[PDB]
From a paper:
The only discernible differences between the wild type TKD and ΔL747-E749 are a shortening of strand β3 (from its C-terminal end) and loss of the first turn of helix αC. These changes result from deletion of the three residues (L747, R748, and E749: orange in Fig. 3d) from the beginning of the β3/αC loop. The ΔL747-E749 TKD structure also shows that a 3-residue deletion from the β3/αC loop can be tolerated without major disruption. Interestingly, parallel HDX-MS analysis of the less active ΔL747-E749 TKD variant showed that it does not show the enhanced exchange seen for other exon 19 deletion variants. Our ΔL747-E749 crystal structure shows how such a 3-residue deletion can be tolerated without major disruption (consistent with HDX-MS studies of this variant showing a rigid wild type-like ATP-binding site).
Tyrosine kinase inhibitors (TKIs) are used to treat non-small cell lung cancers (NSCLC) driven by [name] ([name]) mutations in the tyrosine kinase domain (TKD). The most common exon 19 mutation, which accounts for ~33% of [name] mutations in NSCLC, causes a 5-residue deletion (ΔE746-A750) from the loop connecting the third β-strand of the [name] TKD (β3) to the key regulatory αC helix. Determining the first crystal structure of an exon 19-mutated [name] TKD and analyzing structural dynamics using hydrogen–deuterium exchange mass spectrometry (HDX-MS) further suggested explanations for the different ATP-binding characteristics of exon 19 variants.
Numbering used by the authors: 698 to 746, 750 to 859, 876 to 997, 999 to 1009
Write the structure that this text describes.
Amino acid sequence: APNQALLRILKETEFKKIKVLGSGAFGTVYKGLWIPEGEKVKIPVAIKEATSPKANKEILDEAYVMASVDNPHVCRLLGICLTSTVQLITQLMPFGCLLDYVREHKDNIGSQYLLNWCVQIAKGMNYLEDRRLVHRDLAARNVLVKTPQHVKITDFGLAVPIKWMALESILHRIYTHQSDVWSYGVTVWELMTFGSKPYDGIPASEISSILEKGERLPQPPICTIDVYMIMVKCWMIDADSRPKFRELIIEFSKMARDPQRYLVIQGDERMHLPSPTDSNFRALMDEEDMDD
């Protein structure tokens, strides 16, 4: 099954860095726009610049993975730039990572959005399953927010988050798709608790025997036993007894019809989050998921 992904090399005269969005280990990442020349099109992008000409290797590997996927709930690569420090041009996710998003707005997300995020993340995970790719670091941090109604997974297939890993990944370093549903169970617990740290007071070493013997995360207050039951089903030690992503899409999109039936958030009906208005820094030709 040939890979056949298309790796686009981009001209840096085609994109402009607007503001810095981060800096540190991996490198400085910029919010910017890409103008495919002769196309009369401006694309809001994120440009990940390598820390130094030595840290390139980590970038080109990331470019290999991102180019090899295509799903509405997986992050999209547009191209790379082979400068002195190579540049990684990815779709701009203006609202950041879902972890920071649920913490900042905790008092304005209703049940419709929580359950819709679970079904969307499960969709992307089901896609990475169909492609036989294992994420190995599924967390609330590695889920980026395009709009409050559209989220996409990121940082897939590249490699310690001990509190997110399944037991076979702990003791035996075994990473499969059923080890990913365990991480999926933790992230749902992350969202249902509005960005809480799993096993807050516990050190990393004690976790293995805590799970091996039989303890798990507690029940989120807003969570009914229905949504909490599938969270614990994700945390079985027997990977084959854990549910499948295909089933998690089904179960969640079901609760996504009567959301007040499965998540008790006081004031749920009064809550809401913004819509994609024409906010920018001028820009009358903007797109992103519509450029093909």
